């Protein structure tokens, strides 16, 4: 299917060979304020964008918006700059990307870890785009990442890595249990992206060597370790999960060039999410 | 949602505190013979009576909404799994095989690049998994230690996770719906609605990251199954495998062991969809 | 499909040389006091019934909400006043079926008639039923369809009718323009049921004989001619709507007992809708 | 939604104001050739250059999205003509909408009347458009309907309409009982266009008034198509025809021969979508 999502929904488009790709968004409530300026940005961090309706007087009319880009996942960025935006102005969230392994060389992300924890309630795009292309926020390993880099250039190889993000304020109640969990939401937007392997949340698959206990005691003060949902349903603290991706052409700057692509997908699944679940508030 | 999948939908119910749970499948073929007999087993696997409430008439379907009945809950996936499992058994020859791979620290070797590991992949069976007994990890030089390790646990009156695996044969190419629903997706989503599920992986998911794009495509390093049957989001008629981690907890702590037949149920659905919605656009 | 709506979505299964036949509601929110006791009306309205799950202690715990009775509609019927009863709390919506024609004895109901606009803005369930099975509520004529449905008993032979249904008090914005507009998903919903031929809203078929100026203009004090609907969209007036029956085993009261059935899909369709526009509303 | 359809989808958007307005369909085949060539016409028919952005290489489906956009219901009739050579090719099937009604001049249309039923199993564009702007394949009405059209001209007025479709040639199947019948989806598609009031197939309203064995009896004094060419909600291999009433009102008064292209396009991916989830099923 080219379609994602329920209520907030975007349909995409586009060959290479064509002259053009892009989505049409709906969904969009009327009001908001967009242009072509809210959506560029995000654009520029993956490597010319026209709005064609949905707005008007730089507003959106709540109907289908279209963009076309002068196969494809711009048309993933793109639509998720208008989720996000929708989800700026109406909850205060913070969607953040970066890069926590590249070959061999792992940054440290365990949920017991306090230090990778204050990682998760601090980090900003802005420090993350800082450390430059590798954006990996930990010094201690982001220059040997480049090194691990430069190496299998040099080789005409390639390598992948880890993609991880983190989402905070966001609202409880989030999730469809049973059968639409937030998580499995998430899963689905983060396999469907080129090249990934897998998805993995909160404690994941390093925290299934230790015990039950010291998952939910509140002194081992507890950190987050569910990855911010409970039954299927966020639960108020932060979100955070990561993705592998594949080397393979080759890149091998594959992973850093997720970043905003794994953004996108989660702020569409979440805009989606904060609608159904305004859906059912009473 | 309580509804999943496409053409081949499956609509759960089921409190426990109430008298029964169940599930209502819907696109389910006419044709196929159908009993409580198809059913049970893999029911018998997760340990709970089945009634088949609708869809078939002289113990075949009707192909209209099969409603099943079982005397909060995840016998819907089971029992509504194994309807689609037949479907696919019918129709296609496909085998569907879950095992524990990893019991907390203990972990069966699974790496995409070991030969070894692709020789299980390709001739580990259901039978052979449960004949190892409970901890249904068919390597025995960690199963017993995997055993013994649930032990430790059990004394501390704590619990531990751990990781199952599931390979998928015979699997016909050119299911999926890349851009958005690429089977993986699908998979995806499935295995991480399953209760305490953290993840999913497939092919040579995160431990292939560190290793290069030469050793993945290299037609010698004779080349393995490292995508785990996907290519552009869609089967390749390679085998696929991939796996789940599972949280540990009330506690278990004999969770890992207990999800294979729901993580087989949730592939038979996602595969039995995926038919559907192929064989719809063949032409 | 046996899956009905987007959000408040109803599954139904049932053969009748089985056991049994029901219906799973979900997307119905916690709260709502629900028993048996709000169900059996609607369809004793038609001629047993236990909730499986989806309620503890009366109330909904906003799961799905299985129903079994002891191919099949009692499965509309019976989750349709689940819909109904939600709508009731949730707006103070009339939903009120009524039969309008039996063979050839037409009740009058023209849109421009403000005779039957005073019947349109009255008209309530009580009132119907008392009219006795038939279910006409203007006496010039109820006897009439009553000798008329009697003359075909006669001949061992059946007829059809028209069953007429109007809601009130809608709020408005229920609908979603372009394809899913209100009155599509009513005529989906309508043309659904067993024996149904067709669906008009508003001037319908009549109306086409009538100008454009005699429709829109505020003298003729203009009455209800859309149906309720502008741009596909509830506009805060009466709805109201009409459902040719077909006679045929025969009946001929096919056309009286679809009234409950006409009411079960209207607030199906409605309650639908209310949710898809509370997720929208921002 | 913007969106229609289930597997033969189609998306559309656009404002007026705006440069451009267009629509995505995705389901497509790959395979079947397709230039603006096969768009065009139909968009002539309403009256708007067409360009085809994606979908195709080589003037052939690459089975991926394909957009269209146009220098509203143009995304209707464009995705629509697409929807109608998918049909072309792969069964046969001819869809011919023409007006009925124009006022209080009525064409004929009794199920019963086999004048009626000799147009529905004959009609075809080419003959509806020659009798004009006024698409009435009946001449003793149809230039009653211009007059007609032009008394409320006269007094800067307007008036509706009646559309009536047939479609022929369609496989037996088409359908999925319960919720989404055939003519329910029918439905659905024609009171979504703008200005219709309404939607009936076969005998429809008007027999209501006739009895059930005049209904079903093999003859009348050879039974004819009264049901419309579905029975359970699934197509029956005959003749689907139904009619659809426009309201007048800016005026028009043209509003109702200007729909025949619309209500053609909606029949079309209705049936389009129906014939893969046929296929999808077909075991």
Redesign the interface.
Known sequence: ????GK?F?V?????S??????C?V??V?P?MSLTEADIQPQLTRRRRVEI???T?FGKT??????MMIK?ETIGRVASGAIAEKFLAQ?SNVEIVAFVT?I??IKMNRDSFDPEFQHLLNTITREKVDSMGPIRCPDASVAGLMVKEIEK?RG?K??????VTCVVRNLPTGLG??????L??????????IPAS?????????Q???????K?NDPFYTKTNNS?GVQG?ISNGENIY?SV?????R???AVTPRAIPIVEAMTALVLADAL??Q?????
Chains 1, 3 share one sequence.
């Open positions: 299917m080219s379609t994602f209520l929904r349909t995409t488009y586009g060959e060979h064509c002259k053009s790709v892009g049409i709906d969904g409530p009001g064609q309706s949905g008007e009319l709540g109907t289908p918006i279209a196969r109406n392994q070959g061999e299998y080789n190889d390639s390598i992948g890595g880890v469809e249990p049973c059968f639409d969990k998580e499995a939401m998430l899963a689905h937007a983060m396999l469907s392997k897998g998805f993995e949340i909160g404690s994941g698959f925290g299934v060597s230790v015990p039950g206990s998952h990855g299927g999960f592998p991706f594949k080397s393979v080759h890149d091998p609608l159904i305004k859906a059912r508030d009473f």
